[PDB]
Amino acid sequence: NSFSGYLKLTDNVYIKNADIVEEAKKVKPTVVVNAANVYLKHGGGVAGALNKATNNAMQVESDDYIATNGPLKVGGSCVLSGHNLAKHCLHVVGPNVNKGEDIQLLKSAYENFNQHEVLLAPLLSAGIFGADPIHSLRVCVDTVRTNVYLAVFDKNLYDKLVSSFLE
Numbered sequence: 001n002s003f004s005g006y007l008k009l010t011d012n013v014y015i016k017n018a019d020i021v022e023e024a025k026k027v028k029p030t031v032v033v034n035a036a037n038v039y040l041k042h043g044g045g046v047a048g049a050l051n052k053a054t055n056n057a058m059q060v061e062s063d064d065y066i067a068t069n070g071p072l073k074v075g076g077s078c079v080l081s082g083h084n085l086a087k088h089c090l091h092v093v094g095p096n097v098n099k100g101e102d103i104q105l106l107k108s109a110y111e112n113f114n115q116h117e118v119l120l121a122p123l124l125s126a127g128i129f130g131a132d133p134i135h136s137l138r139v140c141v142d143t144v145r146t147n148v149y150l151a152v153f154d155k156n157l158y159d160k161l162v163s164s165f166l167e
């Protein structure tokens with residue numbers, strides 16, 4: 001968990017302008033969070049990038065999990081192997097507001113992080129999931145009580161988030 005170059009926002013929330021895939025390779029954290037969907041189909045975005053970095057081993061493991069346990073619920077999670085990226089991957093489903101899912105489930109989604117002492121994570125429900133990224137950061141700060149290192153792969157969004165938080 002040798003995270004470097006993060007800006008500490010609160011006692012337990014740190015943030016960096018970085019690609020989560022590159023952070024996972026450098027740090028090899030105990031837990032990396034995936035921004036998953038309920039069927040664990042890692043077809044693009046953050047989930048697609050993490051799967052590609054495991055040379056599709058994450059997708060094969062995920063399909064086997066789904067066959068045995070069924071889909072996740074929005075706001076839920078499951079712990080699977082981290083493969084070459086981390087000891088474990090915590091697949092968390094945040095709401096996709098562009099598909100009509102309830103923004104209130106973003107609190108339930110971040111609550112899953114509290115079962116792990118230290119995590120490397122993306123900003124849940126941001127990008128094409130349609131949530132307001134400044135609201136996502138506020139929910140993270142208000143809900144996560146363990147140590148979370150957020151990697152946001154966009155300098156423009158990183159600067160807006162830091163400015164909004166320090167207001």
Ligand SMILES: CNC(=O)c1cc2c(N[C@H](c3ccc4c(c3)S(=O)(=O)CCC4)C(C)C)ncnc2[nH]1
Nearest residue numbers: 019020035045046049123126127128129151153154
């Ligand atoms: C090669 N790496 C990547 O493509 C990559 C993208 C990437 C990344 N993207 C951010 C992001 C955060 C949350 C979600 C999305 C996107 S999504 O559009 O995939 C839908 C799921 C939720 C945006 C906002 C900057 N944050 C952190 N490391 C990264 N790595």
